[model samples]
Target: NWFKITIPYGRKYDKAWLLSMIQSKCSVPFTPIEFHYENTRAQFFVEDASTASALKAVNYKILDRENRRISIIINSSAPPHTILNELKPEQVEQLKLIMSKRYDGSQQALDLKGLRSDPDLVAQNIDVVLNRRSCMAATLRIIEENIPELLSLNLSNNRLYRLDDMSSIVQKAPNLKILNLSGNELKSERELDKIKGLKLEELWLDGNSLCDTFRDQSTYISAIRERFPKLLRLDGHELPPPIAF
Candidate 1:
């Protein structure tokens, strides 16, 4: 007659940790908040009876069950490494303090996109992955100057377009291996000219004006194959090492 559950929290399993991961994959603040079961466990109450029944029907690894109370582990989708990086606790704390306007304490973990500074310096790692964001030379300059050690990046479908837009990417993010510029307006071969000379292994330029993979695929592939002779992958597939004439 209920979906009464005990939520566990410890060093690896806690409110902030679980909260951030759950919201990343699914919706939350859930139905109730701070409904503690004990010191470390919580009561995640499922309000509706039908919802409770559906939850009961689902298979999960249960730890304890008695008197209409069930203890179980709810797993987060993305790995801890996605959140765990070079950031220290004090640094993250400072970030939280500085970003209090955006940090509403509603979601469980750090929203990197929401946790932004006006000068646009991330001071720790290079991460700005989410909706309705911008990328430009001026904004990217601080990222370049402050934290250029960032490797792989995804800037797809962010509505970014400029001739020397990637000058920062060219100058910064030096060891970057993977880049996704697939959904932007990289239409011309000239527009793509700036991407030359990087030590890139994987590059994606799909669905842009630059390369119509449907019509002039060979030409696009040729430009990439020639321009980036060091490229090991295009889109998701591997490209053989370019041979000399």
Candidate 2:
């Protein structure tokens, strides 16, 4: 689907100037030649998906003309914030069906790994990635209401960048003990603190940027344990007993 770009009203700037900047600064060769300007805003069609994504780089970059922070609306039609603000009946049923299919009632496991790419969802063009806080909240709420017995949740490879909005899962699924956050964009231990209340027995965060920051395996295990004291396994490996200092 095509994405539209919007720049909010500010000191007047020509569509030519805005388009030129988008092409120049976004570092992408694609050009958006057509634009619409009202007194209130400037809008443009970014026909190429990758080109539209490139606009995020310049979203709030300050412009010299008005000393204004150029606001780029990457996905105005369904921005992440408003996408799941109020789920429609079809949307709600679709998400529930996807979740139900992923749930393993026998194991009490909910395998939500690569959720956005689920075959059924892709067929229906539904995106339920946890990277969007709103989607994450909605998905967790559904799980809390329907699958309160959840013990294992695999959120690996979902491209999640932040965990602040995920803290609610602690209270939502109090029985949760296994969580897989592998292959995502988590960058530091601090983000783990956002969900520290979950006393997990097993955790996986191997492919994240945070894993690269540790100097050694011992340090990595120790750091992870600080956030998950009950962790018995991490990234498919058994942990050594904590060395009492």
User: What CA root-mean-square deviation does each model show from the true structure?
Assistant: 16.9, 10.5
lDDT of 1 by residue, 131-238 (tens): 212324433444465446555655567554544656546777677666667777665766656767567778887767767543665666778866677888898887
Candidates' C-alpha lDDT: 0.51, 0.80
Clashes of 2: 0
* Candidate 1 global CA lDDT score: 0.51
TM-score of predicted model 1?
0.43
Residue pairs of candidate 2 with colliding backbone atoms: none
Question: Clashes in model 1: which pairs?
Answer: 9-13, 10-13, 186-210, 187-209, 187-210
81-163, model 2: which lDDT tens digit per residue?
A: 34334456687689989899999989999999988889998898776667876688788889988998899999999998989
Model 2's alpha-carbon lDDT is 0.80
